[PDB]
Amino acid sequence: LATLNCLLGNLYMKLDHSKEGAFYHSEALAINPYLWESYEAICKMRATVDLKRVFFDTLPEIMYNFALILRSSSQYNSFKAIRLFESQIPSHIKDTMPWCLVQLGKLHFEIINYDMSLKYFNRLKDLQPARVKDMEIFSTLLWHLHDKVKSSNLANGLMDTMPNKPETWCCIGNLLSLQKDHDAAIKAFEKATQLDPNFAYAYTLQGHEHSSNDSSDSAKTCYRKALACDPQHYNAYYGLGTSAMKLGQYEEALLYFEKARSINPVNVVLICCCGGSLEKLGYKEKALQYYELACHLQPTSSLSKYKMGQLLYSMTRYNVALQTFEELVKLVPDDATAHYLLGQTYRIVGRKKDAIKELTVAMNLDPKGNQVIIDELQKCH
């Protein structure tokens, strides 16, 4: 009378609703704490239990630490789990454990830190060359790195070892999308989901490729299929919100962006998209709050600082706008439009000596729009 509750949970997860299935998974954990599959099932949702009473009321402590790691990863708070990996889970388990390597690499990849995830679960790939499960994360990381040789290595190896696994065809499609082609990548994801349904990531990549192909309806259908396969997946929600933004209807765009942000609170892109939706709706006061949260949440992010400065200049908080633009330039000098706001703020404050240099930089960056920069120089003196 422990696996029956797990079966109940699984059938509820699969058919209609997640709430009753998570309840029965919790009951199964009550009967026996060593049903890790139930913990993975509940962690697939954003659902948690009180681990202290589950695992207590050094093996139990190790299991409790691993449960906390998974709960934090599901809750998208990578910082605490990295710290526990630092303190608990000693090295001779941490490095050898393939699943710990999977989770650690996914955690580091969730943060903008990219090279370290590559190193960690590249060591994983070295340990288990035939591992296929959870390799779409390597595919996505390699796409983000804009690197082709290691993606080709991955694709060739997975094609040689498992011709038929969905992850393999997904990686092939990601490589095809990376190189130049989109329709071949779409065909790739279609075969990948044809061989194995319920794979929401394939549908998400289908929708992304369709959106990049300027086909709104197909991308929407792919995203809805992804949501049907998986109720909780922020990637497809973000894709739907971007599609709504491109269509101009800001209400369902804000709806989708907020729904995506709800399950992934720490992500500067989602925060910025929600803030832009609020600004389109006109809620200037509330839009700053998310942008203010985003800038403090992660510095060295061009979009968050740019939107912060744009909004402050819109309603004239010049004192903080000047410093946010100054730091924006410090963390990156190649922004063309940003230096324009730098110069506008400098002239409005009344420091012509910095304004002249800044507008000179802006003129250097934008040969085409130099005439408007020239006009601002005329207005400078």
């Binding site: 002249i356 240099k357 000179t360 930089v361 003129m363 250097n364 040969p367 130099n370 003196h381």
Partner: protein, 386 residues
């Protein structure tokens, strides 16, 4: 014993006996885990253009940070490999040591930090880095020369920096090293003092006709447009060293002003047959074309010289001149703006941009740029005339 192997390795390395030197260095390292021997092995790897192997040698054992010299070698290998992020990582954003008969080790690290910042186009931080490097140890000269050559400081600020630093370390050689450093200082300010100093250095000591003293004389004449003496001195020095890159820009400018087409063609061919990679040769060919009224074609060769070597004022300024000389006035402004932004600290690009703003008959912006230029350079006939 091991000392004999160490000295043999050193002698082989000095003698460009690369295989034997690396061989003995590797074995003296394997014999004893002394990080100085690892530094020597990394030196041998660096010398034969094998930077990645030295980097991986110094990183594999994490022996960097234990001793500073190997850290410097690793940082230098990284900046040679253009992986500036990791070089800044190993060296540090700022000075970590801020509170033998050789250059102090900490000064070299700060010089490398300044060079990395200069490569990253962070001129404001490169300036303070180079200033701190020259202030910490006066034995160093590379930071001083880089600052003077790349014009990261205004001439008044350069003179203030020179006066601020002392010469207590040299001791007996205090006056001669003061004069030697004073040779390289920027002009436009109290040049008579430099004349007196090089005159003292000429007859009192045996350095009467050396390369840098005559280079300073040529620079003085070129600034004062004494082109006859410019050509005379440049010839009597080039007759000795035909490919001295320190004087070639001034020599080429002198020949352009004198319109000695035939001598310029000789120099262009001689440098084309010998130094095709260096941007000096292509600058010479471009100015040969410029002397023949070939602005449209010389644009391409100025572009080539600029690409083959960044941070070269001559090439980009000549390119902007090719733009402004004949028609197409619209983007000469953009070219001069690029010159001003990418080459801060020189009054010449600002003055040129203001001059061009005058040429389009826009007045207030020209006045603003010219007051900026006068702020940068107080003593220059061109800016005050404009």
């Amino acid at each position: 014993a091991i000392e004999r192997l160490r000295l043999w390795r050193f002698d082989a390395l000095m003698q460009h006996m690369y295989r034997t030197a690396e061989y003995i260095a590797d074995k003296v390292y394997n014999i004893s885990n002394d990080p100085d021997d690892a530094f020597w092995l990394g030196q041998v790897y660096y010398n034969n253009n094998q930077y990645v192997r030295a980097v991986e040698l110094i990183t594999r054992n994490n022996l960097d940070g234990v001793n500073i010299l190997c850290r410097y070698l690793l940082g230098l290998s990284f900046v040679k490999l253009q992986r500036f992020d990791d070089a800044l990582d190993v060296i540090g954003e700022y000075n970590p040591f801020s509170e033998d008969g050789g250059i102090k080790m900490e000064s070299s690290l700060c010089f490398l930090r300044g060079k990395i910042y200069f490569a990253q186009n962070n001129f404001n931080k490169a300036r303070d880095a180079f200033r701190e490097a020259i202030l910490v140890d006066i034995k160093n000269f590379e930071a001083f020369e880089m600052l003077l050559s790349k014009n990261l400081l205004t001439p008044q600020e350069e003179w203030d920096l020179f006066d601020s630093l002392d010469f207590k370390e040299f001791g007996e050689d205090k006056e001669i090293m003061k004069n030697l450093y004073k040779i390289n200082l920027s002009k436009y300010i109290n040049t008579e003092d430099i004349t007196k100093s090089n005159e003292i250095l000429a007859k009192d000591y045996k350095l009467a006709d050396n390369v840098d003293v005559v280079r300073s004389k040529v620079d003085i004449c070129y600034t004062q447009c004494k082109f006859n003496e410019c050509l005379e001195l440049c010839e009597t020095v080039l007759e000795n060293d035909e490919f001295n890159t320190n004087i070639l820009p001034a020599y080429i400018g002198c020949l352009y002003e004198l319109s000695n087409k035939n001598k310029l063609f000789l120099l262009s061919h001689r440098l084309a047959e010998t130094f095709p990679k260096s941007a000096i040769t292509w600058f010479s060919v471009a100015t040969y074309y410029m002397s023949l009224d070939r602005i449209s074609e010389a644009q391409k060769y100025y572009s080539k010289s600029s690409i083959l070597d960044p941070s070269f004022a001559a090439a980009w300024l000549g390119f902007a001149h090719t733009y402004a000389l004949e028609g197409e006035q619209d983007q000469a402004l953009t070219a001069y703006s690029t010159a001003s932004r990418f080459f801060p600290g020189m009054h010449l690009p600002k003055l040129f941009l203001g001059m061009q703003f005058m040429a389009m008959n826009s007045l207030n912006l020209a006045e603003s740029y010219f007051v900026l230029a006068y702020d940068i350079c107080p003593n220059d006939p061109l800016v005050l005339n404009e």
